[PDB]
Amino acid sequence: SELLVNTKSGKVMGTRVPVLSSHISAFLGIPFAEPPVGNMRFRRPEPKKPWSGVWNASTYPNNCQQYVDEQFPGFSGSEMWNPNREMSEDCLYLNIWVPSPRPKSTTVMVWIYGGGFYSGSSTLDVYNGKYLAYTEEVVLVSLSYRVGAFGFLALHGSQEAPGNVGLLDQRMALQWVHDNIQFFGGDPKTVTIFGESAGGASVGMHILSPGSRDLFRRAILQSGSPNCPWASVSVAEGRRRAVELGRNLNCNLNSDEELIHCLREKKPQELIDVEWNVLPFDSIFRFSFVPVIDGEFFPTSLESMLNSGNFKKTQILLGVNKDEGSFFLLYGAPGFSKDSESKISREDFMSGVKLSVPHANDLGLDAVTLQYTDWMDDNNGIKNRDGLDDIVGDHNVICPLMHFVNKYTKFGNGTYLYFFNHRASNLVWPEWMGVIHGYEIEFVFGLPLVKELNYTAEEEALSRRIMHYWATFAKTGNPNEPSKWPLFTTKEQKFIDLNTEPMKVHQRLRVQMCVFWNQFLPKLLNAT
Amino acid sequence: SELLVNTKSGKVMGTRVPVLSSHISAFLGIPFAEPPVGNMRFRRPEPKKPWSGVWNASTYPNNCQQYVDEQFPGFSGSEMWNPNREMSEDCLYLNIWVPSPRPKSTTVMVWIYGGGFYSGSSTLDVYNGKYLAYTEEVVLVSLSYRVGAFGFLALHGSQEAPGNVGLLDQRMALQWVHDNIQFFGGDPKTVTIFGESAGGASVGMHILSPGSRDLFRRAILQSGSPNCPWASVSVAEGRRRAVELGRNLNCNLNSDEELIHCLREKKPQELIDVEWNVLPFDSIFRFSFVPVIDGEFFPTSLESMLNSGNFKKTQILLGVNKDEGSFFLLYGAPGFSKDSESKISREDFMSGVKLSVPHANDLGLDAVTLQYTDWMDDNNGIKNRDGLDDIVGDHNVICPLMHFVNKYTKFGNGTYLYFFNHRASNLVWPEWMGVIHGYEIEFVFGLPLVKELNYTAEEEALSRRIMHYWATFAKTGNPNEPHSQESKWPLFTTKEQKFIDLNTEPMKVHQRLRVQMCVFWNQFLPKLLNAT
Numbered sequence A: 001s002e003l004l005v006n007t008k009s010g011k012v013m014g015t016r017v018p019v020l021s022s023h024i025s026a027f028l029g030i031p032f033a034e035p036p037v038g039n040m041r042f043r044r045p046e047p048k049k050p051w052s053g054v055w056n057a058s059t060y061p062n063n064c065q066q067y068v069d070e071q072f073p074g075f076s077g078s079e080m081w082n083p084n085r086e087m088s089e090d091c092l093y094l095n096i097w098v099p100s101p102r103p104k105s106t107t108v109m110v111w112i113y114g115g116g117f118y119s120g121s122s123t124l125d126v127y128n129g130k131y132l133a134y135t136e137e138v139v140l141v142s143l144s145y146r147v148g149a150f151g152f153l154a155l156h157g158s159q160e161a162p163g164n165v166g167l168l169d170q171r172m173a174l175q176w177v178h179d180n181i182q183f184f185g186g187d188p189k190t191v192t193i194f195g196e197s198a199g200g201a202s203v204g205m206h207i208l209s210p211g212s213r214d215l216f217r218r219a220i221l222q223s224g225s226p227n228c229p230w231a232s233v234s235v236a237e238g239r240r241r242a243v244e245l246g247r248n249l250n251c252n253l254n255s256d257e258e259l260i261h262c263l264r265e266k267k268p269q270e271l272i273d274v275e276w277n278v279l280p281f282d283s284i285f286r287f288s289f290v291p292v293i294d295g296e297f298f299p300t301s302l303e304s305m306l307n308s309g310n311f312k313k314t315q316i317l318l319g320v321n322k323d324e325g326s327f328f329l330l331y332g333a334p335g336f337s338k339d340s341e342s343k344i345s346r347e348d349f350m351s352g353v354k355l356s357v358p359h360a361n362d363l364g365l366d367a368v369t370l371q372y373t374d375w376m377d378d379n380n381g382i383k384n385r386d387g388l389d390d391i392v393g394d395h396n397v398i399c400p401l402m403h404f405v406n407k408y409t410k411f412g413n414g415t416y417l418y419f420f421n422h423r424a425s426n427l428v429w430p431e432w433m434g435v436i437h438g439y440e441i442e443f444v445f446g447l448p449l450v451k452e453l454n455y456t457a458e459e460e461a462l463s464r465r466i467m468h469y470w471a472t473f474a475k476t477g478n479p480n481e482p483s484k485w486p487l488f489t490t491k492e493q494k495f496i497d498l499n500t501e502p503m504k505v506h507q508r509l510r511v512q513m514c515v516f517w518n519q520f521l522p523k524l525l526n527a528t
Numbered sequence B: 001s002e003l004l005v006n007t008k009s010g011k012v013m014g015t016r017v018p019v020l021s022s023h024i025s026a027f028l029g030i031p032f033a034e035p036p037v038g039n040m041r042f043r044r045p046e047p048k049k050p051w052s053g054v055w056n057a058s059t060y061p062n063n064c065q066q067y068v069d070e071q072f073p074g075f076s077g078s079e080m081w082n083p084n085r086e087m088s089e090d091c092l093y094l095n096i097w098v099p100s101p102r103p104k105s106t107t108v109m110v111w112i113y114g115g116g117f118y119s120g121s122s123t124l125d126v127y128n129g130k131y132l133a134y135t136e137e138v139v140l141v142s143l144s145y146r147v148g149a150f151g152f153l154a155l156h157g158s159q160e161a162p163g164n165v166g167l168l169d170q171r172m173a174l175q176w177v178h179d180n181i182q183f184f185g186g187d188p189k190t191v192t193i194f195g196e197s198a199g200g201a202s203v204g205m206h207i208l209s210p211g212s213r214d215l216f217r218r219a220i221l222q223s224g225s226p227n228c229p230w231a232s233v234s235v236a237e238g239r240r241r242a243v244e245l246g247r248n249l250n251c252n253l254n255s256d257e258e259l260i261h262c263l264r265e266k267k268p269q270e271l272i273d274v275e276w277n278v279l280p281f282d283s284i285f286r287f288s289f290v291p292v293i294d295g296e297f298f299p300t301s302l303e304s305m306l307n308s309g310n311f312k313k314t315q316i317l318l319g320v321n322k323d324e325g326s327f328f329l330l331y332g333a334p335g336f337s338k339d340s341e342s343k344i345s346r347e348d349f350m351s352g353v354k355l356s357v358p359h360a361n362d363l364g365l366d367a368v369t370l371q372y373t374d375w376m377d378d379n380n381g382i383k384n385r386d387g388l389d390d391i392v393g394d395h396n397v398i399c400p401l402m403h404f405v406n407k408y409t410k411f412g413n414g415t416y417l418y419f420f421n422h423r424a425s426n427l428v429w430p431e432w433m434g435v436i437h438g439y440e441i442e443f444v445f446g447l448p449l450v451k452e453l454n455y456t457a458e459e460e461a462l463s464r465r466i467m468h469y470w471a472t473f474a475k476t477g478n479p480n481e482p483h484s485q486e487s488k489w490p491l492f493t494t495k496e497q498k499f500i501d502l503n504t505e506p507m508k509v510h511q512r513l514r515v516q517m518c519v520f521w522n523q524f525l526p527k528l529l530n531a532t
């Protein structure tokens, strides 16, 4: 049948799912690895052992162990990101959406969820790949990877918890797609990896990583990049935090093995309950366990790799959302409220910058303040808010990506940059938050197409062209089908606005502030 | 007679001069000190010793030995600032304009010319004090002081060349005014000292210095203040420079005694010719020999005196001109010319900020650049030109004045701040230069009132109200006339920080003069540079 597929490791039986008064095939919860439980906790994934019989891929798998958000219980805007399935260490599964009739060696798109490496699920309602696969006729895969300590505890030197294993999970899911997507009507030579946040960062790490380069054709990065300040740590910092987790759980710390064996004896939630205590500073947009520059997965420093062109040369399509910082200020910065205009005083502004730039010294904090403060009206609450909404957004998302984009374009084969500034009419978050980190995703996955989700007519149309650009990029390496989205070049540095209005072409995306973040501030801090 | 006066030192015979269809009394070239010549070069000024008979005070005196500007020979715009009389080390004299008939005991205004402490004359056409004295009915004094090495050679520890002697020269003219202005109809209890550029910095230095404090009542500072980066140097830097000056003239350098004796044998021009060779860096708006923070004229750092309120508390009126830097970039920065729009390329901009901020390190230069660059349009010549202009004007004049006003106001008894942004219709300099450094002076001294100098009717009006605000400030301590229908120049307070524009348009009140950039120059950069 159309739902029965013979794979390299075994047989799989999918399910027919309805989509916009039609149908397509879905293959949910296919294992690409051996459950990383028990003795296998913190270790490099192992390929899934073949199975006899038929595997039931009609329902979503379990979600990986993660810190669940409870800031706003019941509230949809936050819960839509929380796990919607039972959590388990047995969570290394992938989802495939296959149009009907099954295509022949067609375009493949792999989704990598984000959530700062500490959280994330492949089963979220907004990651439902049926609308994208059906509308664009692409085979859509959504993978999963260990997060938090479970995927990134890094004690460099030991083979028990070497680090980056969460990234290695992603890579084995990619290998699986490579060895098996052909059986589903997908061309393994035309694979596009795409994601947002830590998932967009992930994408970039695979472009950098030699061991991952050959497992995909192109890349799409959404509001994230490898060089982000929160996306990685040195081996010594990784070890520092891993030791700090042991100290927090009263573990023996004489040796790595002794410490690792102790962390394995602990129940999943026990680790999760002390996860944030290892962070060196009181901050926002900083996550405990993330990728490490170990010399293995990543040969040298991200920067030196980027300067020397030591990375996969291909076409990339990436971009940022207008208000990346607002989600992080609401959760951790004083003055910010989900139920108010969140006007910030000068005092809450000073402390807000200290929370956004944790590594900077006093001179550094003065530079940031001087850069984002209007001194003729320094007590304007809106300006202090919007101004703080830029620091976190420029520092953590926009400027890192623009540094990436400009370093990549020097050796690459084609870059396409976007700025997403449309605020969804049915948004549940307050107006001061603007176009929030992660709210382009519902447009990339075509949710505006399902009418009972109450999107405007022009939002569905905006969703349809974002999807077409995505898919058309995936298929040809150019989002344009023969108003054009122009190529980003180091001379022109062109990009487009991604909204309901007729496409407009701009230049030098936030160059003023990004010259500060990528060049001046780093130089200052190094010198001081 | 109205023109013959019995001063404390001796008799003086003035001259009757015409002014706008009327007449006034003028006493030019009156000596207030012994000529600082021979073995008296570099030494503190001594009082003029009494004379018998009448002193002919009917003609301007000699200008002090200074570097003459020969960038544009014959050009009125630059030569109007050059010496207009013979140069001589015998230059310590002062000029007085007295209304006729003589007033009883009226308001006194003393002018201290500027010119980076290296140049300047009391005799320039723009300093003709007849118009202001006749028009505002005040007694106008014009003084002189030793400039360059002559008035500021500083070998600290030595009593032959202790430094600050040019400032001391000023103070003696001031003491003279105090001991003798009453005979001319002036009130020694009501003297306002005012000056532009190094003259405004001089005024502020007398506000800070304990020995000059009681010689005046009020103060006016124009386009200059005491803490300006170019206005003073440490005793070390003063000593280094005086040694480098000896080294440039093959002098014996074993002791201050031998070094000073060597320089006293040199002809005046011999010193002037190497004067600029002693500066630390290639730069603009930096002068060689200037006031030294000696611990005598200045008890402690200007900043600590400002912080602890160790200064004369009175009323001050001060302000700045829209484009304070253009004059300096034209003379020493590549790309700038008086025969073109002076559009500056990105390269010429980078080298420009280096010449402008000579003391800053690489990181410092980068901060300055980042602060004044429009990165979306960084190849714009107009923007690079204006950008550079503002750098030089904010750094050297405006922000150090804002720092000063802001500090003084916490202790003062009245502060009135102005922003002069009127471009004179008959200006001789190019359009890009804007409202140049020194060009409000002609309005202060009422030049626009002499119809044959070709100013517009509205320019004569501006000049009248500027002179009136100045005079009324000198008389009352408030530029505004009580219960007058005219708009009002509001007080500058630390909380409100108000100031007015000074032009032909109806007055406007603004707040926090160039804060953004001044927070950078006065607060951030100094910290940045301190961290190193």
Ligand SMILES: C[As+](C)(C)CCO[C@@H](c1ccccc1[N+](=O)O)C(F)(F)F
Residues within 6 Å of the ligand: A069, A078, A081, A114, A115, A116, A119, A120, A196, A197, A198, A327, A328, A329, A331, A437, A438, A439, A441
């Ligand atoms: C497409 As998401 C990378 C699951 C939306 C933003 O999520 C942030 C976040 C930021 C600030 C407060 C809470 C959260 N959150 O609950 O997910 C992060 F970092 F978790 F991903």
Ligand SMILES: C[As+](C)(C)CCO[C@@H](c1ccccc1[N+](=O)O)C(F)(F)F
Residues within 6 Å of the ligand: A276, A283, A284, A285, A286, A287, A328, A330, A331, A332, A333
């Ligand atoms: C014991 As906590 C008060 C969940 C440590 C920091 O928490 C942040 C936060 C919360 C949710 C997602 C990301 C972040 N962060 O990156 O800092 C905030 F916002 F609560 F303070």
Ligand SMILES: C[As+](C)(C)CCO[C@@H](c1ccccc1[N+](=O)O)C(F)(F)F
Residues within 6 Å of the ligand: B069, B078, B081, B114, B115, B116, B119, B120, B196, B197, B198, B327, B328, B329, B331, B437, B438, B441
């Ligand atoms: C009221 As004046 C202080 C005698 C005019 C500007 O003078 C400047 C200056 C600035 C740049 C180029 C040339 C000159 N100049 O010839 O006097 C200086 F040097 F006197 F301060």
Ligand SMILES: C[As+](C)(C)CCO[C@@H](c1ccccc1[N+](=O)O)C(F)(F)F
Residues within 6 Å of the ligand: B276, B277, B283, B284, B285, B286, B328, B329, B331, B332, B333
């Ligand atoms: C031996 As030279 C070329 C007279 C020292 C610097 O010269 C300045 C300058 C020259 C004349 C008056 C004022 C200035 N200044 O204030 O910097 C500049 F700008 F020409 F280079």
Ligand SMILES: [Cl-]
Residues within 6 Å of the ligand: A157, A158, A159, A160, A161, A256, A257
């Ligand atoms: Cl081990």
